[PDB]
Amino acid sequence: KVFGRCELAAAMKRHGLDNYRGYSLGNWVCAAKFESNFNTQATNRNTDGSTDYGILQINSRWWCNDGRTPGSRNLCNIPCSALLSSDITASVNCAKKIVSDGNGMNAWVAWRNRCKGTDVQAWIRGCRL
Ligand SMILES: [Cl-]
Ligand SMILES: [Cl-]
Ligand SMILES: [Cl-]
Ligand code: NA
Ligand code: NA
């Protein structure tokens, strides 16, 4: 599913991301924009052989099982395919664990490089939320 911007904002807010770990909703919308282009089916293969999955590009080295990331863990207790679903509950729930791991949203390189320190509000402009 390719979410609209406000559509994704509303879903993330329902699922309790707004201000989770102190990160405003716009941070999460911005991260999803640059990570997945709002596409739940986004997949990216990393140099280390792991893969990123879904709207928030959750990585198989630590967070989900894809059966092909040697030495990896599955800390969210899900198949990485769960993360490609049109429904974002699994992605949002795993994201809560990742952002809680110690470095906040810096866990998403694209957030650090593209969203962090920017006017992340803008991402929820116009949304009736
Ligand atoms: Cl915001
Ligand atoms: Cl594996
Ligand atoms: Cl933080
Ligand atoms: Na990524
Ligand atoms: Na894994």
Curated annotation (Swiss-Prot):
Q: State a single Gene Ontology molecular function.
A: lysozyme activity
Q: Which SUPFAM superfamilies match?
A: Lysozyme-like
* Binding, substrate: D101
Domain C-type lysozyme per the UniProt entry, residue ranges? 1-129
Q: Where in the cell is it found?
A: Secreted
Q: Which PANTHER family match?
A: LYSOZYME C
Record family assignment: Belongs to the glycosyl hydrolase 22 family.
Under which name does UniProt file this protein? Lysozyme C
